Design an enzyme around this catalytic site. Sequence first.
Site, PDB file in Angstrom:
ATOM      1  N   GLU C  97       0.835  -1.185   0.000  1.00  0.00           N
ATOM      2  CA  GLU C  97       0.000   0.000   0.000  1.00  0.00           C
ATOM      3  C   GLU C  97       0.877   1.246   0.000  1.00  0.00           C
ATOM      4  OE1 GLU C  97      -2.532  -1.033  -1.051  1.00  0.00           O
ATOM      5  OE2 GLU C  97      -4.166  -1.023   0.421  1.00  0.00           O
ATOM      6  N   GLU C 127      -3.672   5.316  -0.487  1.00  0.00           N
ATOM      7  CA  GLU C 127      -2.536   4.455  -0.214  1.00  0.00           C
ATOM      8  C   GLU C 127      -1.816   4.885   1.054  1.00  0.00           C
ATOM      9  OE1 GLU C 127      -3.798   2.152  -3.373  1.00  0.00           O
ATOM     10  OE2 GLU C 127      -2.890   1.934  -1.383  1.00  0.00           O
ATOM     11  N   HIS C 130      -4.151   3.527   3.675  1.00  0.00           N
ATOM     12  CA  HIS C 130      -3.933   2.095   3.762  1.00  0.00           C
ATOM     13  C   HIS C 130      -2.639   1.712   4.457  1.00  0.00           C
ATOM     14  CE1 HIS C 130      -6.779   1.726   0.045  1.00  0.00           C
ATOM     15  NE2 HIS C 130      -7.430   1.971   1.168  1.00  0.00           N
ATOM     16  N   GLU C 192      -4.207  -5.472  -7.812  1.00  0.00           N
ATOM     17  CA  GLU C 192      -5.477  -5.341  -7.105  1.00  0.00           C
ATOM     18  C   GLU C 192      -6.549  -6.268  -7.675  1.00  0.00           C
ATOM     19  OE1 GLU C 192      -5.710  -1.001  -7.844  1.00  0.00           O
ATOM     20  OE2 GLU C 192      -5.499  -0.750  -5.670  1.00  0.00           O
ATOM     21  N   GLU C 226     -11.215   0.460  -2.461  1.00  0.00           N
ATOM     22  CA  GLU C 226     -10.831  -0.127  -3.742  1.00  0.00           C
ATOM     23  C   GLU C 226     -11.761   0.103  -4.927  1.00  0.00           C
ATOM     24  OE1 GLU C 226      -7.565  -1.859  -3.685  1.00  0.00           O
ATOM     25  OE2 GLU C 226      -7.694  -0.625  -1.878  1.00  0.00           O
ATOM     26  N   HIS C 229     -10.217   2.581  -6.947  1.00  0.00           N
ATOM     27  CA  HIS C 229      -8.956   2.030  -7.419  1.00  0.00           C
ATOM     28  C   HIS C 229      -9.135   1.176  -8.660  1.00  0.00           C
ATOM     29  CE1 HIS C 229      -7.012   2.497  -3.163  1.00  0.00           C
ATOM     30  NE2 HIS C 229      -7.665   3.574  -3.561  1.00  0.00           N
TER      31      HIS C 229
END
Lengths: 388, 388, 510, 510, 166
Positions: C97, C127, C130, C192, C226, C229
């Site tokens: 991350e 990130e 995270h 991912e 996510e 993402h």
Amino acid sequence: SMLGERRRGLTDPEMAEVILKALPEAPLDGNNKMGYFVTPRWKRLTEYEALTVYAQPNADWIAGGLDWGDWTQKFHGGRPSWGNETTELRTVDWFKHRDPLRRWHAPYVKDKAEEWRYTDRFLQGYSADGQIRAMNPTWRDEFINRYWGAFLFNEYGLFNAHSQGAREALSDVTRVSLAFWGFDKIDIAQMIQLERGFLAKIVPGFDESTAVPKAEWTNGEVYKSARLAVEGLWQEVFDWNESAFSVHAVYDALFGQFVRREFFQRLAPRFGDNLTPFFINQAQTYFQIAKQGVQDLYYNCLGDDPEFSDYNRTVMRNWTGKWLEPTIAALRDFMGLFAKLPAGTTDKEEITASLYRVVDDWIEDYASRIDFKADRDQIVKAVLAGLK
Amino acid sequence: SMLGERRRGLTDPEMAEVILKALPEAPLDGNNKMGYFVTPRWKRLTEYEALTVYAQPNADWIAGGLDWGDWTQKFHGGRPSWGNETTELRTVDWFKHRDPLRRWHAPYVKDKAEEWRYTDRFLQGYSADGQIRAMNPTWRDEFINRYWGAFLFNEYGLFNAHSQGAREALSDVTRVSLAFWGFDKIDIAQMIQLERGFLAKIVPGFDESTAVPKAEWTNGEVYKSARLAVEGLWQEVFDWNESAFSVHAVYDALFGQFVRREFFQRLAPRFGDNLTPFFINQAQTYFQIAKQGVQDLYYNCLGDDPEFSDYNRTVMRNWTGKWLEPTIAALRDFMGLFAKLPAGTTDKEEITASLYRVVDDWIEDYASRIDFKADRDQIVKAVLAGLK
Amino acid sequence: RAPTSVNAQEVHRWLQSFNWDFKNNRTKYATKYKMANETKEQFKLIAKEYARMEAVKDERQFGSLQDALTRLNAGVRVHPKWNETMKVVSNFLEVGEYNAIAATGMLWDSAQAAEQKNGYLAQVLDEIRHTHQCAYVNYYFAKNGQDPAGHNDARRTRTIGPLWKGMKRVFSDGFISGDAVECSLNLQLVGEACFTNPLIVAVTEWAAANGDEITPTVFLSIETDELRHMANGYQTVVSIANDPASAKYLNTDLNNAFWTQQKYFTPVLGMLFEYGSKFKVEPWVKTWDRWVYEDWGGIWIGRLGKYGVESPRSLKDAKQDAYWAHHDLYLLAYALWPTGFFRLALPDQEEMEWFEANYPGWYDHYGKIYEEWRARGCEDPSSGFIPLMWFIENNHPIYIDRVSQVPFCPSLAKGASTLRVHEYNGEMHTFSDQWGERMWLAEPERYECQNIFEQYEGRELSEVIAELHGLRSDGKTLIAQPHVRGDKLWTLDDIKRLNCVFKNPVKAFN
Amino acid sequence: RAPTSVNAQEVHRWLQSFNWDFKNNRTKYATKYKMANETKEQFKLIAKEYARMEAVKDERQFGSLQDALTRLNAGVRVHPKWNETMKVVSNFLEVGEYNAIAATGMLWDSAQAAEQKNGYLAQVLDEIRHTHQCAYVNYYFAKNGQDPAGHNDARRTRTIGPLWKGMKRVFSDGFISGDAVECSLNLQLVGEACFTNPLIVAVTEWAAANGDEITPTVFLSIETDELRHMANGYQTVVSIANDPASAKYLNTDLNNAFWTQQKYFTPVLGMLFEYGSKFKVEPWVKTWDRWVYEDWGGIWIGRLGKYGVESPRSLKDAKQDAYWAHHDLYLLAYALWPTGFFRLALPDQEEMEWFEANYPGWYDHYGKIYEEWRARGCEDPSSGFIPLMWFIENNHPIYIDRVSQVPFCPSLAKGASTLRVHEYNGEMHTFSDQWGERMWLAEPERYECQNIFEQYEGRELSEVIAELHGLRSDGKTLIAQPHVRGDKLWTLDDIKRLNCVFKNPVKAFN
Amino acid sequence: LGIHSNDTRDAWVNKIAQLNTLEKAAEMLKQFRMDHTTPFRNSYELDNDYLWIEAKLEEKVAVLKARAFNEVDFRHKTAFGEDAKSVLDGTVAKMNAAKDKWEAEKIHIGFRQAYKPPIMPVNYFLDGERQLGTRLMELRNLNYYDTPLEELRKQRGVRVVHLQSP
Ligand SMILES: [Ca+2]
Ligand SMILES: [Ca+2]
């Protein structure tokens, strides 16, 4: 110990095994909605209503109540814990009110907390940025440390005027709104004081004591009539509604808005002061918030009651007249404040322009709602009839 | 089902018992402090330091790194994922930096979130209070929509100048500070657009399109040199420290501070505009927050590095001279804006005094920290030549 | 004069226009692709609204952690094996991350369309979020768990072991080192999409099954981020599809990125799940097949076929391995247990049955080996035995893939067991497969990571552990352990007595 | 230009001066006492710091509730008996907290010192917070629990039963009706200091023992606010200590306050705890003695001794009536189970053993009665039996104390059995103790609360239930039940077939 | 015919609707409070409804007094032309001129029975409440326990129906 000695039914194998075994295969009622019997003000029931409506244990004899019978313990004399006898207004149901902002305790402290923390951050930046420099010395040590400050005692007064409502309110929804209207008022008053304490920290020689601002409020002529109107609203009114109404739909709508929005929210900057306006933004945001509540209660609910509409408007028009005069006075004595302002600061066409804005807003957001026939020019004339 | 199918080890009798059975009598180590090995900047290790320091897997060959060996996969050609080669500055340890505000992700989005919700509340109180009525039309439609509007591109550009630092920063503490400095900038740019969008809603005919302020930014004269400097800072500087340092300790500290505080903040109030100052308070709070981190990294950690103190100051003095000229050019061009103000708005003495303030603050908070010999009169004189 | 305000979408509608044209307005990073400046983003956010929605998630998360979960002593009531697994899982993910922070900042630099930059921007901050979230899990387990060691210092004790090197390849260097687009494939389009979302959810499942409610609370929140993402990885393909070079390079980078991720995560995630837990959720193989082969090998890869994208030519060999790789690897991780910052356990009786049931032949190979090591006293500190010794006695050298860093034993493996040894300009290089080998042959200078055998050559085991702080607070007991029980933990001296001295296995070649 | 700001403490320092003098600057409420205008409050807080510390608490609380606790299905995995008990505990405390809102508003008006008002103000807001918190507990159990009925409508279904009346006396009317100081004692001096504060903690203990992690999450938070409520109460006695009326009326108001509160909570709390649960924490006897006698009636009242505060003259009486109070009352609550809004269960074998072990003699009296009712089918809808019938058959009248509203049965009670009946101006009045009788004799107009037998006179049982909505969403099944199992639930018809008609028990003396 | 809806209540509903005069409605309220409220009420026949009835009655008197008095009078004059403040100060007078709690309580209850809004304006009423109520307590709570129950029952004038104490 690492596990502790207290066994919990949720995690303890033995105990949870017993619990699980006692459970039904499915819930014993599909109706998992608390307050499902409440009449929604909007599309679907809100968390605000579910958590607030009918919390107050009124019996059916107090319009809206769902309980039955007398209270279990009354006052010496027989006065009910809560009764219709504590206010002139009548309604088909005291639980009709709804804070348009749907504020129960959680959202309320959350919002105020965000402001408090931001305020902190802001002050730390103001001081760091040194924006104080561009601030007119006079205005600082005079119109703020004396006139603005003294105004705190005014907000404090309106705050205290809410005490009885907190006690006498005939429903949860009204008591919660009332408490928030008053709480917001002492907040502002404490904010006004916070600035002074701040200015003190960044302006050597600046006295944060209430001595001056108070002396000015207690003995001064600037807010003289203002204080008289306050003390009256606070200590001479025993009707919890008349108090709330007269305070928010009359005195603070007129005198309050003018002093806040038309004097300091329109001048502090001219003297290089973005500080005071930072706090006025709060008080004004608070004013608008409280306003939506006052309108729903006294207008949407009481003033438009399908049974006591006329009756209530009559009382409100009456209270309106009853307090319009003391408010006007308070304004006049205030007008005498400009005379202390340095030359060119503000003419008379403006002062007039501002006063007219207040009255027009007041008439448009309040007076017109209860059909209280008002005369803008006369009011203005009356108020304005006290400059220099 | 009411219970569900998934059995959880914490609440499932059988599984929990197996788990509790396998547990040690007590912790296998009494040192329950993650990051205990991190040298605390303050009295005790902070949550901020624990969750942040050493998250960046730097090996020992990048000052302060605890790992060993080359990177596992590098760029075509051989360039390391992170390396000393990405900046001229050197230090005994890139992990020494500490955001004095100790902002890790949670505290950061929390404060910004508070500011966001309050902003919404403020705008609602503002529109309902009808304060827009007393704001000068010319100031509103001209200086706010066009000039304050064009400034968003300046803030946006400075935001973008952090993109490479986000990628190249040699430590987690610097990466995080740099990211937040940049994020606060795009936030300010977005707040400028938010105000324009707010005005479009409460002001008939106000066009929120960015076409006008954008054309002013890209083709006007007032911001020509500001744009040229921004384009340079963002796209002509490949060194991540030169970028951050020159942005916050030179360009934004001189040009930015003058525009935001000495022009808009200083003059908006004069035109009945309490709206813009609201957002500027945010930008200034942010500027002051970033300044603390900037000072810690470049002065405390680098400019005072026990090994590269002399070296780093030489480099930063080099960068200050390199960017002071374009920054003076930006201020010089900006002076043109004053000729567009309504006569009597401000004068040469006030403008000069305000330039001296920004320059004096800059010399104190930045220039003096690296022994950069700045001539306050020389700077101001150079800028005033821009006055029409 | 009605109460009004402005929302995020109302501002975002003009964000695309924020960028302007000028000569040098171009990416500072090398790349074979051109990202269209008209490329738009999926979510219409602004700094403040992004902050608010994440702030909301933090409240629930930290609220649960600080209150109920703490009152329920959730930090302790987790299976010992799982407490250990999370030392590795949370910290390794922390760097994945973290590198994604710089990785997206690089994508943000690469993109030219204001909106595409803004999308990546939202991820740069995510990130960071995270990194701090994964850091919190380790922080929480060290503060409230049964064994804080490793949880409390993984950021430095991770560097002792070989499993960590591979992590920096797939979730670190692979995210920022190379063509911005290549880096995005490793991180998003494959990282991912193929492993990381399905993984996060899988992790929360294994965690819950093993008594861990800490990890689900945090990871389920990471999971909600996510969404934006997945959007970044997709638009990256869109931003370069209408580019001539795209057809020429897109598939090669995708193939490489795909193999890069699979090579490490397949055997490692599978290992941590099946061997790092008491209770099982489902056999790693099928958990894989669904991800890499179906949901991604066709469901996700096919959808992007409308851009020239195609199927990974190495998927065959990848699958032809996801069956044994993790089993191959655990043998190695356990044999080298003193090089970690976590405690490992031999499979118990029930587990072996499960292993043999779900992977026929497991026992006749790995099972019997674990039984012998047990007999050799691998669990007991006084045995003077470390599984590594066994590999030495039985002529089973352990090599480190120069590219992926994944340790492998070709003479005992069941996954891709094809050793390739080359000599180039005075240096020896060992590869475990034809994909990595091609990567090195073509890009020698990109892969020069020294392995643990090279760095530790001639070093006595206990010395490395001591130098790199692999001890508990008592300054004597090892962090890593060959068993997960509370008694009889190995000390530094127990290891020293073994007098294990590292040697570089490739030096045997002439 | 150093970053500076001002805190609440720096502002509060001037709060006292906020108030000024003027003619009618006095209380609008009757009171024999004079609250000193020179009185200070303990916590130097301003509205903003108050909101902040409370919002922080809210985050954790709601965060735990909405996230981890929900993920763990905490609203379901609680013992049926307790799910029911919380319908009463949460909602009854709600009205108590709610009326406390008006009480403190009244106190705020009573105080003349700016700080004393501010102190009471904090509670006004606290009590609103507590109303909403208790509301949330029922809201949560309604939304996620095994039986929403009751939790979802207690605000109206509470009015069917006799237990609700007494609650309005101690935590409603006793909180706002009478001298402000008298109300203050009932609330803060006795209510909160003696029962509420300890109760709140105890509730969390019983809840945890029975699988309920919801109540601890909320009540512990409420608990954190108590430190201020205690502060206000102590300040009340201080602000009037220097007044001549104090030494003339304080104690009487205190004794009456003490008796009023214990009269209800002594029986009710022990009942709810011991009979509304499966797993027990501690015998209610040892708890009461600690709370009432030791702590409150000793450590707490003792500290006020320097202000003329004496021990309640009714303390001897209270203790002598307490021992069996809760056991005596449950017989009545169960016998009248159809009038409730919660389901009750008879003690199981372990429980009966627990009761006997802790209260020798319990089985020969209560135990045998319950076994008799059960063998006769009081749990089975087909039995045609409701325990109220057994009271009628065995000539055991059930009376409602005109003052405290607590149900009592002199002819059966193992505890107090005194009964005083009086007629006054065409109306009969029944009393259960000498303190309540005196309260009535002296203040006839303060106590005219109609009892259930008076309001339901001549009414058939199923009609009252139906009219007051004592039914589940199916319109047939009663909310209340004589058992907590999932099958054989009583319906309105089962009750109608009983043909139970209420009678005003007092008339038998005519 | 139950708790919230019953013939008795329905009866008065129709009975109140017939009031077309402030004087009539005002007087009826008075007579209602004399007949059904407080321990001194003339009868307990409406014990289960009088509270709800009384309110439906205050309502009518509320509406009428509205459409009859002028602002100054609605705020200062009872629905009986009585001068609010006059009566107020008049009652507080007798209250403070009370020899004992027995005299005191008799005044207070009568006050509430006669001037309860919409009779007297709420402002004065509650102002009285705080004055009368205060005095009442002061007398009552003075040596509250001195008198023995036996004697007290006699003073109150209750008719002891049954006593039992083991
Ligand atoms: Ca030019
Ligand atoms: Ca050779």
